[PDB]
Curated annotation (Swiss-Prot), chain A:
Section covered of the full-length record: 3 to 103 of 131
Zinc recorded as keyword: no
Gene name in the database record: MMGT1
Name under which the protein is recorded: ER membrane protein complex subunit 5
Organism: Homo sapiens
Subunit structure: Component of the ER membrane protein complex (EMC).
Any GO MF annotation of the entry: inorganic cation transmembrane transporter activity
Family: Belongs to the membrane magnesium transporter (TC 1.A.67) family.
UniProtKB/Swiss-Prot annotation, chain B:
Entire protein: shown range: 448 to 497 of 993
Places the protein is found: Endoplasmic reticulum membrane
Disease linked to the protein: Cerebellar atrophy, visual impairment, and psychomotor retardation: An autosomal recessive, neurodegenerative disorder characterized by developmental delay, intellectual disability, hypotonia, scoliosis, cerebellar atrophy, and variable dysmorphic features.
UniProt source species: Homo sapiens (Human)
Name of the protein in its database record: ER membrane protein complex subunit 1
Family indicated by similarity: Belongs to the EMC1 family.
Assembly, per entry: Component of the ER membrane protein complex (EMC).
Function field: Part of the endoplasmic reticulum membrane protein complex (EMC) that enables the energy-independent insertion into endoplasmic reticulum membranes of newly synthesized membrane proteins. Preferentially accommodates proteins with transmembrane domains that are weakly hydrophobic or contain destabilizing features such as charged and aromatic residues. Involved in the cotranslational insertion of multi-pass membrane proteins in which stop-transfer membrane-anchor sequences become ER membrane spanning helices.
Amino acid sequence: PSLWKGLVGIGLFALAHAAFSAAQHRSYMRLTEKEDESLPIDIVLQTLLAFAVTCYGIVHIAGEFKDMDATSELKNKTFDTLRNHPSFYVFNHRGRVLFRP
Amino acid sequence: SLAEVVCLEMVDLPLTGAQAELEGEFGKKADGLLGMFLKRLSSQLILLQA
């Protein structure tokens, strides 16, 4: 589906929110001068989940691959679209006297 | 009376109204992860409301 863009959007939003939460916790820890200096696992889980979701989403929105075999792109071509040369077109055919003389 | 200062100490002023909230969301020691999540979310919600 085309909803992968919204998925990576929500992932990036959650990642930005986790970054803001980490900034707040760092400010608090530098205010109180605690020797633990351990990020809360609550925000660490959010960061990891957002990173995983966003990476899996951008893996999908990157675009699909194409076959390497050239004989696969011309399998639907027909000689009616290969004989025509846009450079050597001539306008003295019957379509001019038939369609709108 | 200040011409004979004998001792001097410099104390830090109290915490601002904004820095007072950082003690609330961090250090409440919620039971589970889902509880601490909603607690921090509500703190940030109060901040965005302000």
